[PDB]
RNA sequence: AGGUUCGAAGACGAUCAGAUACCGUCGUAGUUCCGACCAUAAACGAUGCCGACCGGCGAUGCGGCGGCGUUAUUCCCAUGACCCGCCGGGCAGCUUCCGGGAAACCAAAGUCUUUGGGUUCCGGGGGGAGUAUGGUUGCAAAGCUGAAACUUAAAGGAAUUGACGG
């Protein structure tokens, strides 16, 4: 997209798989995208907004989008260091 | 037995990069492959890599991007001139927009855009897209 | 596993890999202090010695060669020597 | 259409196999190929363990067994119903059919 | 779950280790071995427990992270496990579905029995193969209970645990459904829930006819 | 020898078990006759037949539990599956008995060291796993 | 599968011309004997001088005379 | 008089979600043929490809049925292919006109060279593949057309693709697999990763979780 | 014919050949 | 040289409409050994070699390295026989949406229109034909190299349905 006019001539903008950074198809029906809670600091309360990943088809079928949700939760920081 | 060091390397990673690896290991390490990983890291489409020294030809380790999509090579290193660079880019490359076919000239290792910048043709070495 | 850290793996699995196959070619061999009863000196012998080490001083053999490692006689000391 | 990876041989690092004579037909049969039967039978009828115990002139006497191998071509085989084709599927599993021991 | 407030305590410890949940398999899969700490002389895997409740909570996160309790759809082709999630679904507002799981139901969108959930959770990947599978057609994200020897085909929040005994699978939907009970406003975090565990628990039905008649006889004796 | 009951008759029989439990019986004739005001059967070998299959679901679910519901059954499935809460609970065991390697695995969680967990003697052999092949 | 080294073009030319008499196409132009057994010599049309009138029968699926002459 | 049993096909009925590209994003499958006229309506062409009469032998003769290849999609980006086997050539053609709206996918147009415009070839070079029939789509400048076979040309031309070069091998008489092929290689036009796509995406909320509370009272 | 047999029916023609041209 | 058994050829008995056969009884060359030839097999994995990369699992053979224990002896260690692992090199197997393929299937038959690691041999619609001729090897049988005229619209491969099966 982004001709030298400077204008975005494209329909869409498909998704990234947030672990093998591959493109999410528009009939990749077994790409996911899930939500994880983060809670406060205090009580340990849904505290309102969330963060997402997105999952290939082909990660998610090879068996490693176990492996690789849990590692996206070290980066953001919901699962602690010393799982 | 071993001939063609870089195509070894190159297929390797291309090989971790399809199957989804962060990182990948390539064995054989030698000036060519380093200068080669170095025009693929300023053009951004792999990470770091460091190169692990033993007493013998040391060991790479590449951070992958997950940005690559092929970086065959061209293994009889065919002298390619001004006049005939185009006809190994649409050949090669998928699109005039993106690609790079590297080429080891007289004034180093590059890639075609940057060859044809400073005027030298060379021998082609790979490509990577 | 997508994400194995090939740049730092931990102690145990290069132990377990073979010596050609690890980060840095290490040798599984050791040189060691060999004391056999009834004498006053220290001999030093190859972990995988293929000959018969004997004493310039006492008639007794120390080491007989094996498939692998070398084989000490009964009753003879041993120390590894830095590692 | 190969229909058997394993070529309907048990061989794998040979070049060649002795072959053996069929027991039923004298065919020669590699031996890998042939299909072996080992049969464990009491020389005696299961309907005669009565009147040769009562005519023993032995009162604990166990009795004796017969072991014969057998050795089939596969021509043999199918014809005298030791082995059956099996479906496409089917024809994969290695493992005997039960002893039916209830 | 960093926080301190969102750690293990002691008695959910003494309950993991009572009814065994980290005893696993004699065999060991290869996206399992992440999860695993030892290996006894027996032969069974021991699985790590801190490691255990992360994946729990970060299953919880993911089950609280919809606004919709009725979406999320909780499954079990299993007796040890029927029970389990008939009683999560009744405290978290969830779906649930028990013993047959009839094909076709995030799929083919005529029969009165088609759903589409926002998620799937699952007590055995080798079990509940189906759904699993038709949620790889349907964009559906999976969580299953897994043991040691358990595939990761189409698991996202595998919680590395056991399937296998009937005291571990009751007590971690009964731990689930606490968790995700205390992330929401139901329950305070302080005082202990007052669901009892073993409600959650699987009761063979040789027991299911006798222990009800002993009650009564110790009742009126 | 050829008295297999149709869907038809077997169909009709559920339902009406269903919808109306209480009134039927393990009698044909009374079963008979109440199936001549629940239902407008067209044919009497019809309602006969009907009727015939419901005492053999009516005889069998005052047993058993069939495929067919119940109220009063269902209210005892919910009862026994919902309550006799054992009021102390199974995961309450005065002693915990413990493996040397899942205690070496609670001291790092740093919650090792409870007195409720008691340390077994490891078993010795490594016997486990079963004799390969046949024999 | 094939030589690609630097120095390998007289082997690749050598392979190509000792495959090319495999296809019928180039075999019958560059033989000769097509050429000499070819009635009309390389030439697009020839004149004769008709010996005889003949009728030849059709194939299988059809059943006619081709009325012929042979020259 | 469409009533839907989808919460997609709920969504759009009521015009809470907006385009057909956000059901593409996140990649939701499409069961109801109704959402897309909904959304592309009054801009699909529709024209049939082949009507190859399929028989089976059975005990009384052969049977025949007719499998009809139908191909779409409005000239401006979108394209879908669907195949239909009825007994009857008529309740052929609207099942394959049904299955066609169903497998409607985006196509990416890119630039040949010096970006000026709206653009009018593919990105780069793709292939597709189904039976022996690859199909490999060319980028082409500006006024060269659609150099390719009667069947691809057809198909890339209601996918709006204005200039491609083409080169097909293996069996293309089967327009069975030569037309999937080219629909193969049109759909993945998005699949290929390029250097404009390596910015990280920020993600957006999900119209299932976003239309949540809207489909508790209305999708019941 | 049984491809075998038609080597056979072969050589036996290559060896009726050869007796008639050493013949002459 | 030796020739027990079996057994091309051959003889006879049966079967059959005929039966130069399948079945049966004999039985030569051969089958055995030494020396010298011949160089062909569905000589098969119908699948070139060397090198790298790309899943999992349980076994198995050899070598090496670790370890609870049982066992052999002895008074202890080794050392053998088991048991639980690890490494390397083999024969394989199961499994998988690695990927490929027309598919059957193949962890190679993958890393191929995103086409290039090195290097051999070799195919170009079916027949004619592995024929004719020439050359060459051989005691011979035959081996190696090896066309054309002419003829033909298919011949083939993998899978589906049906029909049929002594
Ligand atoms: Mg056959
Ligand atoms: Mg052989
Ligand atoms: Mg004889
Ligand atoms: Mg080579
Ligand atoms: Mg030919
Ligand atoms: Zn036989």
């Known amino acids: 997209m982004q001709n030298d006019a400077g204008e975005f001539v494209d329909l869409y903008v498909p998704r990234k798989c947030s672990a093998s950074n591959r493109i999410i198809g528009a009939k990749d029906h077994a790409s996911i995208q899930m939500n994880v809670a983060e809670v406060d600091k205090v009580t340990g309360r849904f505290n309102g907004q969330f963060k997402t990943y997105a999952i290939c088809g082909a990660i998610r079928r090879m068996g490693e989008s176990d492996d690789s949700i849990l590692r996206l939760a070290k980066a953001d920081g919901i699962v602690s260091k010393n799982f | 037995v071993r001939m063609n060091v870089l195509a070894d390397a190159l297929k390797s990673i291309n090989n971790a990069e399809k199957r989804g690896k962060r990182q990948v290991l390539i064995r054989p390490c030698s000036k060519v492959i380093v200068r080669f990983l170095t025009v693929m890291m300023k053009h951004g489409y792999i990470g770091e890599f460091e190169i692990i020294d033993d007493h013998r030809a040391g060991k790479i380790v590449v951070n992958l991007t997950g940005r690559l999509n092929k970086c065959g090579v061209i293994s009889p290193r065919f002298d390619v001139q001004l006049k005939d660079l185009e006809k190994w880019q649409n050949n090669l490359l998928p699109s005039r927009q993106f690609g790079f076919i590297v080429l080891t000239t007289s004034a180093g290792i590059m890639d075609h855009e940057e060859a044809r910048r400073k005027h030298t043709g060379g021998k082609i070495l790979g490509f990577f897209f | 596993p997508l994400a194995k850290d090939l740049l730092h793996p931990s102690p145990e699995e290069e132990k377990r890999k073979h010596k050609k196959k690890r980060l840095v070619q290490s040798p599984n061999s050791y040189f060691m202090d060999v004391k056999c009863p009834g004498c006053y000196k220290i001999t030093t012998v190859f972990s995988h010695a293929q000959t018969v080490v004997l004493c310039v001083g006492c008639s007794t053999v120390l080491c007989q060669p094996t498939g692998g490692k070398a084989r000490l006689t009964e009753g003879c000391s041993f120390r590894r020597k830095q590692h | 259409t190969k229909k058997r990876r394993n070529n309907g041989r048990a061989k794998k690092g040979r070049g060649h196999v002795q072959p053996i004579r069929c027991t039923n037909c004298a065919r020669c049969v590699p031996k890998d190929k042939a299909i072996k039967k080992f049969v464990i039978r009491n020389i005696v009828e299961a309907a005669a363990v009565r009147d040769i115990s009562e005519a023993s002139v032995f009162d604990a006497y166990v009795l004796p067994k017969l072991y014969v191998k057998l050795h089939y071509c596969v021509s043999c085989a199918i014809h005298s119903k030791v082995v059956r084709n099996r479906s496409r599927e089917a024809r994969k599993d290695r493992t005997p059919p039960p002893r039916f021991r209830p | 779950g960093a926080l301190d407030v969102l750690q293990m305590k002691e008695e959910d410890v003494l309950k993991f280790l009572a009814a065994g949940t980290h005893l696993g398999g004699t065999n060991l899969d290869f996206q399992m071995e992440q999860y695993i700490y030892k290996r006894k002389s027996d032969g069974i895997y021991i699985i790590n427990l801190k490691r255990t409740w992360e994946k729990l909570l970060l299953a919880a996160r993911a089950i609280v992270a919809i606004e919709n309790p009725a979406d999320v759809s909780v499954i079990s082709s299993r007796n040890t496990g029927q029970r389990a999630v008939l009683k999560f679904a009744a405290a978290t507002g969830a779906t649930p579905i028990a013993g047959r799981f009839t094909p076709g139901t995030f799929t083919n969108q005529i029969q009165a029995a088609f759903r589409e959930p926002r998620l799937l959770v699952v007590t055995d990947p080798r079990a509940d193969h189906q759904p699993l599978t038709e949620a790889s057609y349907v964009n559906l994200p999976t969580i299953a209970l897994c043991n040691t020897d358990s595939p990761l085909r189409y698991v996202d929040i595998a919680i590395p645990c056991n399937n296998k005994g009937a005291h571990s699978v009751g007590l971690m939907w009964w731990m689930l459904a606490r968790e995700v009970l205390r992330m929401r406003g139901t329950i305070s975090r302080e005082h202990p829930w007052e669901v009892m565990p073993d409600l959650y628990f699987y009761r063979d039905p040789e027991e299911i006819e006798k222990e009800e008649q002993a009650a009564a006889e110790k009742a009126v004796t | 020898m050829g008295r297999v009951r149709t869907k038809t008759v077997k169909k009709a029989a559920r339902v009406i078990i269903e919808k109306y439990y209480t009134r039927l019986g393990n009698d044909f004739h009374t079963n008979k006759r109440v199936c001549e005001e629940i239902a407008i059967i067209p044919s009497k070998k019809l309602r006969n037949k009907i009727a015939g299959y419901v005492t053999h679901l009516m005889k069998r679910i005052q047993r058993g539990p069939v495929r067919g519901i119940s109220i009063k059954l269902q209210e005892e499935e919910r009862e026994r599956r919902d309550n006799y809460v054992p009021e102390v609970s199974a995961l309450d065991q005065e002693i915990i008995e413990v493996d040397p390697d899942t205690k070496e695995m609670l001291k790092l969680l740093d919650f090792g060291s409870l007195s409720n967990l008691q340390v077994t003697q490891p078993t010795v052999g490594m016997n486990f796993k079963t004799p390969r092949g046949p024999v | 599968g094939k030589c690609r080294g630097l120095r390998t073009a007289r082997k690749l030319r050598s392979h190509r011309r000792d495959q090319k008499w495999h296809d019928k196409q180039y075999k019958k132009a560059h033989l000769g004997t097509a050429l000499k057994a070819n009635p009309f010599g390389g030439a697009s049309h020839a004149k004769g001088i008709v010996l005889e009138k003949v009728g030849v029968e059709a194939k299988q699926p059809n059943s006619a005379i081709r009325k012929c002459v042979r020259v | 008089e469409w009533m839907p049993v989808t919460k997609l096909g709920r969504l759009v009925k009521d015009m809470k979600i907006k385009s057909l590209e956000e059901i593409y994003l996140f990649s939701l499958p499409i069961k109801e043929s109704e959402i897309i006229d909904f959304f592309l309506g009054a801009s699909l062409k529709d024209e049939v490809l082949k009507i190859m009469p399929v028989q089976k032998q059975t005990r009384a003769g052969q049977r025949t049925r007719f499998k009809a290849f139908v191909a779409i999609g409005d000239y401006n980006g979108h394209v879908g292919l669907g195949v239909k086997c009825s007994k009857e050539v008529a309740t052929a053609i609207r099942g394959a006109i049904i299955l066609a709206k169903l497998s409607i996918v985006p196509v990416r147009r890119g630039y040949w060279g010096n970006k000026i415009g709206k653009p009018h070839t593919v990105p780069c070079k793709v292939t597709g593949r189904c039976g022996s029939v690859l199909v490999r789509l060319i980028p082409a400048p500006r006024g060269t057309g659609i150099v390719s076979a009667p069947v691809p040309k057809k198909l890339l031309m209601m996918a709006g693709i204005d200039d491609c070069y083409t080169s097909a091998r293996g069996c293309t008489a089967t327009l069975g697999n030569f037309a999937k092929a080219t629909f193969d290689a049109i759909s993945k036009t998005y699949s290929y990763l390029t250097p404009d796509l390596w910015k990280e995406t920020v993600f957006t909320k999900s119209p299932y979780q976003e239309f949540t509370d809207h489909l508790v009272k209305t999708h019941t | ?24």
Do not use: D
């Not at chain 9, 036996?12 to 013949?23: I, S």
């Open chain 9, 1 to 24: 014919m049984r491809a075998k047999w038609r080597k056979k029916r072969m050589r036996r023609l290559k060896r009726k050949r050869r007796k008639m041209r050493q013949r002459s």
